Amino acid sequence: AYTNSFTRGVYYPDKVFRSSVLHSTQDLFLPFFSNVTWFHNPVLPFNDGVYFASTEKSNIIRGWIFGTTLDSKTQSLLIVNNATNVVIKVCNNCTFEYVSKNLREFVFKNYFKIYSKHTPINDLPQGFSALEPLVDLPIGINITRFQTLLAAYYVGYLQPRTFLLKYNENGTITDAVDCALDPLSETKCTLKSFTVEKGIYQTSNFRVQPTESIVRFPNKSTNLVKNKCVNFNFNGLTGTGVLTESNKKFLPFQQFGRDIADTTDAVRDPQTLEILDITPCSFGGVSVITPGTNTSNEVAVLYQDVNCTEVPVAIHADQLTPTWRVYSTGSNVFQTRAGCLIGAEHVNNSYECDIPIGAGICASYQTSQSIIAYTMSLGAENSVAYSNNSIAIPTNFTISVTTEILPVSMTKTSVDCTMYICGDSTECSNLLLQYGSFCTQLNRALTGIAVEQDKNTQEVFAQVKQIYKTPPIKDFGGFNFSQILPDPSKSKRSFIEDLLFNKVTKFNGLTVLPPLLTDEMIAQYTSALLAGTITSGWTFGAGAALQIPFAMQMAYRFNGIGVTQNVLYENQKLIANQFNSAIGKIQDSLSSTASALGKLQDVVNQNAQALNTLVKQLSSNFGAISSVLNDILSRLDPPEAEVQIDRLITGRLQSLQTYVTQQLIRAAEIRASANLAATKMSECVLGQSKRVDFCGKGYHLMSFPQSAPHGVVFLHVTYVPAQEKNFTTAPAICHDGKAHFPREGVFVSNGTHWFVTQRNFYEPQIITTDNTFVSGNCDVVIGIVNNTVYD
Amino acid sequence: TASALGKLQDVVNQNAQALNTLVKQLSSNFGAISSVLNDILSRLDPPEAEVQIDRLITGRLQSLQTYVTQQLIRAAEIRASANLAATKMSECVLGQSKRVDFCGKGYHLMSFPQSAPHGVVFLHVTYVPAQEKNFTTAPAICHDGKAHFPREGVFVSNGTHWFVTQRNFYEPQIITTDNTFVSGNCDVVIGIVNNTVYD
Amino acid sequence: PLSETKCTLKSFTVEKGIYQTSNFRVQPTESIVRFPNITNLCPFGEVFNATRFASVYAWNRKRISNCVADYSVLYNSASFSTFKCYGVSPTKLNDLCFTNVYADSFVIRGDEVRQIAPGQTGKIADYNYKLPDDFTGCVIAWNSNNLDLYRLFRKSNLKPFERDISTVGYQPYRVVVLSFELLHAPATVCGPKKSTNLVKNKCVNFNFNGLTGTGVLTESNKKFLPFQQFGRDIADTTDAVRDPQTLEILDITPCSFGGVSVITPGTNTSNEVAVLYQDVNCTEVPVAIHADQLTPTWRVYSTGSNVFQTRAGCLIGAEHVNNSYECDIPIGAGICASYQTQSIIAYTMSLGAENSVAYSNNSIAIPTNFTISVTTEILPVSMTKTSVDCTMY
Amino acid sequence: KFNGLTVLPPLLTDEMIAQYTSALLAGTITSGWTFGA
Amino acid sequence: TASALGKLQDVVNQNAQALNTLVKQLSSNFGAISSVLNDILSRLDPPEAE
Ligand SMILES: *[C@@H]1O[C@H](CO)[C@@H](O)[C@H](O)[C@H]1NC(C)=O
Ligand SMILES: *[C@@H]1O[C@H](CO)[C@@H](O)[C@H](O)[C@H]1NC(C)=O
Ligand SMILES: *[C@@H]1O[C@H](CO)[C@@H](O)[C@H](O)[C@H]1NC(C)=O
Ligand SMILES: *[C@@H]1O[C@H](CO)[C@@H](O)[C@H](O)[C@H]1NC(C)=O
Ligand SMILES: *[C@@H]1O[C@H](CO)[C@@H](O)[C@H](O)[C@H]1NC(C)=O
Ligand SMILES: *[C@@H]1O[C@H](CO)[C@@H](O)[C@H](O)[C@H]1NC(C)=O
Ligand SMILES: *[C@@H]1O[C@H](CO)[C@@H](O)[C@H](O)[C@H]1NC(C)=O
Ligand SMILES: *[C@@H]1O[C@H](CO)[C@@H](O)[C@H](O)[C@H]1NC(C)=O
Ligand SMILES: *[C@@H]1O[C@H](CO)[C@@H](O)[C@H](O)[C@H]1NC(C)=O
Ligand SMILES: *[C@@H]1O[C@H](CO)[C@@H](O)[C@H](O)[C@H]1NC(C)=O
Ligand SMILES: *[C@@H]1O[C@H](CO)[C@@H](O)[C@H](O)[C@H]1NC(C)=O
Ligand SMILES: *[C@@H]1O[C@H](CO)[C@@H](O)[C@H](O)[C@H]1NC(C)=O
Ligand SMILES: *[C@@H]1O[C@H](CO)[C@@H](O)[C@H](O)[C@H]1NC(C)=O
Ligand SMILES: *[C@@H]1O[C@H](CO)[C@@H](O)[C@H](O)[C@H]1NC(C)=O
Ligand SMILES: *[C@@H]1O[C@H](CO)[C@@H](O)[C@H](O)[C@H]1NC(C)=O
Ligand SMILES: *[C@@H]1O[C@H](CO)[C@@H](O)[C@H](O)[C@H]1NC(C)=O
Ligand SMILES: *[C@@H]1O[C@H](CO)[C@@H](O)[C@H](O)[C@H]1NC(C)=O
Ligand SMILES: *[C@@H]1O[C@H](CO)[C@@H](O)[C@H](O)[C@H]1NC(C)=O
Ligand SMILES: *[C@@H]1O[C@H](CO)[C@@H](O)[C@H](O)[C@H]1NC(C)=O
């Protein structure tokens, strides 16, 4: 009888307290969802370590016996528990002695370590319970078999498997992940987290192992094997690859062929005058494609650059868990240009890309729900009804507000060079003094980056000479502006600014310098810019601020984009309502989703990852006897302590140099982004921009700035036509033998009558010498149309 | 003012300091018994001179790599600055720019180039209003039940009379059909006022 | 501080600004050694003075724990021909504390004496007795010709620390190897080091079972399990330690440190400076700046009436001013410093003159005049074409 | 690919890039800047 | 003509040259007595092979 072990049998790997930390350890652990034999007397082998489970209340089981032969000729160990006493012996010829409804778990491993746990239960239960160490017997005995002294118990065997342990605030293990259970758990272990976001993650490395070794010597030699990755040995040079027939013709005195980069590609075998190619056997990456962890646990596996029929072989599929073997076969394979994709159903339909794979292939979690792989769709097919006498003219419009987010600055991290490399060590400092001024160079570069961050922030935000305030009367012609104007009733930031700020959320020589401008000052600058823009248009940026009603400012903007002011003057209420609705939609989207500020989240995550890597680089030996400078100094003499300290110094100096170089490149990127943001605030906010798609999609009317953690957000108010109608158009109108052309507009016809209308809004007008101008005769213009012109 | 050209002097100082650090890096032992190849070779046999020379080679190669990486980053920054300068020469100098604050504060009239050590200097001539006056304004004018809007400018009032003026300079004009156009009626415009339009 | 700034800048003239000159550090005040109170003398007599030693192919092994070893007698004894230690220095045995000791004793020939070392091969060093490449211990060899079997061969080379039993320079030399266990475990075999008292809330140099360090020891409320001896943080660094003599958990906080910046105007203007101690309270500034070991001029910038606590650190030597002006020398968190009536003043930077535009729905401001302004813009274009001959360099 | 070197294919194929450019050309020819606005 | 599209060809050449240099760097001894890992392992002892 076999029973599923669920996820039980996890003990404490070491005696080190940990709290609120995810720690990955490598030791002998019971595999998750394994099979344990159920005995309902028998002698069983020990292997590496034994997990014992008992479900009893009457305490039938009393002890254990361990050994090899269990009858003389060796030492056998024995444990017996009676009443409130426990006796352990290695018996005579005794060399050791020790005296010290219910589910009891025990773990025995070889020094003999015994971990124990006791729980109440009401059929192995489903749950988690860590095992605290209880017994450590200094025996040094070889055990390969054991038996139980007494009616039902479970026996399982431990294996060398890596686990990711989760510690709570009180130091008790709550959850764990078996890194070799399935691709999802491997992804969790690689990400060092229990939650995985949607996407593709490169987790593993796949390589074909050699199957046999062949040696060929000229007249101890073996027979050559073709079409198999083998460990060959021709003459004097060794290698691993696949030997196949080749059409190359070597010269009689030549034995090997080299590629352009000094790489051997063909070899002539010594026994026979034959040339064999050498191709490396398959290798590549193994990536896991998953949706959100809380969405589904289904995953797909992609093996880059491998034939899809050789995936099961050379991946040790037979040596992996049965859970992983699902992702090697199953008639659900798909050979793409990137590689063989297993676990995703191929769909002939095309949708928008969700998770890219390569060569136009995308995967998604769509309909039962399963992973589907398809070819990405470039968009909706369209065909413009083009003709030489038809024009489409809009009759309505929509006011749309879009959002753009740009990073501006970073966190000013300052790394104490000497404290990081040789912290609290005079000998280490003296040894480091021989390396010149690398340390001063690193400090200077970091200081330059820190100053550049403040320069970026000042350039982006400090663009207004004075501080402007909105009047107490907010009669702005129907426009609300209350969502973006500052709220003094509470850090006097606006509602949207608060949403943005809430959306995004010191030792070994590492420090963080505060920015020169505080969030309150940045909010003050943004409020001044908003007040100036609302009250004076672009006059505040051109010079002294000149007040103007907001309706007249919007009329200015429409005239600038090419629409007459009357459109605003008798569509004012509709335009104001559309603007208010757009602002409300922006607020709702910001309050709902959290991926809008991913541009700033990426910068924060990159900086945090770099800092964490720098911190973790201090635990490496770099070839030394230990990674602790104090331990090296207290253990070794100066003649050898110097060598160990030199190794550590070289490693840590290399780590610091790498960190500084990466920080410099990232700072260059952030400075470019800050320059772009400064230009956008100068052009979109302080004026009206005619550049296409610079200040959002559509005809840009205006823009509003907001401050976000280490960045600026632009709300781009634009004009977009909505409904269009067909009309018949003519390049010119012939009235009295002279061609007529419109001053500003197009000629259109509803079927019987001809009018002149503006480009971006349908407004027919009587053709008149005030609307048109005369130029030339009617015999030159192609497509002229006879009509009359009013006078 | 001596510190007017600090942008170019910063580049000069950075390059000079990098070169000075690279030169001073030759005085470091890097773990060897001495920083002089000639002294090492004259004092020691090839078996140990090899170790000393290897230490010196490693140190000096690391110094060169650091210097070259810093120089590459600085060169990329200078290339970005040169591209910006070329764009400014094309737009501000060879034409009139409508971009705000691209060619100086104010309404950019024109610009002049001058040379400087490893740099270019732009003298931006711009227009800036100086003195401003208050006026009463209306969105449109009612004359005969029809709304009149200015062709180019705004309506202003000195207290009793209504004129039409351009945006950036006060120049009152008689409100006529030459500078006003008719569109719509008087019942829809918000804030319309009553006046006369001369024919 | 001004002369220190000059020394760091390698110049006799210092431009106006704030410069990073030196570093802040609190020196330890007390030395703490805490060892278990074990009076059991470690029994090395049964290992060293034993009359009968087993053969080389059946080398005798003994395990030592729960004792206070004294290697000074063995080191000072002249009865040992050679005493070679590899992972630990001979003189640091008296100070270091181990967990377990393995004593392996046998008898070999003088030629094979040199073969008892890591990374060695031979008749005995490869087919009879092996040592790990990272062996940590000491080998003691001495002749016994005046005081008082080799294996031929086998199938292959036995793995280190494995014993298999199946089926002039010629004088006998007794060889005893003491291998120390350095695994992650509570220390058990210590040396004869006298323990001291325990002091808290002080920057001290502690020593818990050989775990050297420096920091401030404070009582913590961590829920340590009975088998847990110490704790680690997110960065895998020691955070709490259990007292070897008392079931008490002590939190370790490293002694205070930070940066020291000097804010000065031009030397042509004034010789007065201000000092900023980054990320530290103003209470610990004088006690750790070594003022009573520094020059009398350095004592001025350690205390005084002009002490300002800012978000960027503690500012000493600058007078706080309620008014706000344009920034002159930045400090952090909106704080700026300047040289004005003169002395160094610290204030909050001003963002500009306040203004309110007289907005209304029927009023417009129109210019009547204008001005023509010419402004200067400077952009770098190129650098110096420097080529360095790497081979000749 | 001999010593751990791999070349990942681009997500967008040459045919897809050509389709983008053809759509842009068709929109420009038959509509002007209205398709972009 | 032939030099019209040199901008893209320069990028291709730079990438190819960088890859070629990276692969070619595997033939250098870097101070060791041999550049072949298998030869070093089969010819030296672990104390020096390390
Ligand atoms: C492992 O256990 C499961 C569940 O009890 C069972 O279905 C399966 O047959 C077992 N495996 C073997 C090899 O018996
Ligand atoms: C324990 O003894 C068995 C029986 O010969 C043997 O096969 C095994 O290798 C031994 N294990 C150890 C660690 O000595
Ligand atoms: C942790 O300890 C605290 C004691 O303050 C207790 O309230 C809490 O329930 C404990 N949590 C767990 C998971 O044991
Ligand atoms: C080597 O010996 C084999 C024996 O069968 C023979 O076939 C082959 O031709 C020989 N090659 C040379 C080069 O002598
Ligand atoms: C996402 O997954 C985490 C992990 O359990 C869960 O706590 C969270 O509620 C999930 N999100 C949603 C919206 O359900
Ligand atoms: C992969 O293996 C199949 C085996 O049927 C073979 O036909 C094919 O040529 C191989 N290569 C590719 C790229 O499919
Ligand atoms: C999917 O499309 C391919 C064309 O490449 C076709 O051969 C196949 O029959 C289609 N499958 C289905 C289920 O329609
Ligand atoms: C334009 O659309 C709005 C709604 O978006 C609608 O209320 C209005 O009536 C439309 N105008 C015309 C002329 O159709
Ligand atoms: C603006 O919108 C708010 C709701 O967001 C509303 O309470 C208010 O009355 C509106 N008008 C003004 C002038 O604030
Ligand atoms: C204009 O006419 C074409 C063809 O008659 C038609 O496809 C198109 O939809 C029409 N436009 C509108 C706005 O209806
Ligand atoms: C448009 O083209 C058609 C031919 O397709 C031609 O008959 C007609 O005259 C043309 N009209 C104009 C206005 O060019
Ligand atoms: C316009 O009138 C307001 C109302 O007090 C005043 O504040 C402002 O200074 C006036 N404008 C000018 C240019 O004087
Ligand atoms: C301006 O607002 C006032 C309300 O205080 C109103 O009476 C007046 O008609 C408005 N004038 C214009 C031109 O909007
Ligand atoms: C006995 O052991 C002691 C160490 O305490 C040593 O000094 C002495 O030489 C030993 N006796 C002999 C005969 O070696
Ligand atoms: C000796 O150490 C024990 C802990 O092992 C402690 O309880 C006891 O108080 C100590 N006694 C003295 C005198 O130090
Ligand atoms: C200091 O400044 C004054 C002008 O205020 C100048 O005359 C003098 O030469 C300067 N000192 C030096 C050493 O240059
Ligand atoms: C000063 O000490 C207090 C507690 O006494 C604590 O906030 C922190 O350690 C220090 N504060 C600052 C701002 O450095
Ligand atoms: C002036 O400074 C003192 C000293 O901190 C402070 O208590 C007081 O509130 C300040 N006065 C004003 C008006 O800020
Ligand atoms: C305009 O300003 C200039 C000086 O810049 C002055 O000479 C001129 O009289 C002013 N004109 C008016 C109308 O105020």
Numbering used by the authors:
A (entry chain B): 27 to 66, 81 to 131, 164 to 172, 187 to 196, 200 to 211, 215 to 242, 263 to 331, 529 to 676, ...
B (entry chain A): 941 to 1139
C (entry chain A): 295 to 442, 452 to 470, 503 to 676, 690 to 741
D (entry chain C): 854 to 890
E (entry chain C): 941 to 990
Publication excerpt:
Severe acute respiratory syndrome coronavirus 2 (SARS-CoV-2), responsible for the COVID-19 pandemic, uses a surface expressed trimeric spike glycoprotein for cell entry. This trimer is the primary target for neutralizing antibodies making it a key candidate for vaccine development. The region encoding for the transmembrane helix and cytosolic tail were replaced by a 27 amino acid C-terminal T4 bacteriophage fibritin foldon domain to ensure protein trimerization.
The cryo-EM structures were determined for both ancestral and Beta spike trimers after incubation at 37 °C. Single particle ab-initio 3D-classification identified one main canonical 3D-class or map for the trimeric protein that corresponds to a single canonical conformation. The ancestral spike trimer map represents the prefusion conformation where two RBDs are in a down conformation, while the third one is facing upward in the up conformation. This quaternary structure is referred to as the one_RBD up conformation and was refined to 2.85 Å. The overall architecture of the trimeric antigen is similar to structures reported previously. The minimal resolution for ancestral trimer is observed for both-down oriented RBDs. The up-oriented RBDs are only visible when reducing the electron density threshold and no density is observed for the distal part. The 2xPro mutation was clearly visible in both the ancestral and Beta trimer models, while the other modifications fall within regions that are not resolved. Ancestral spike trimers transition at a slower rate taking three days to shift meaningfully to the canonical conformation with only ~ 80% canonical conformation after the 5-day time point.
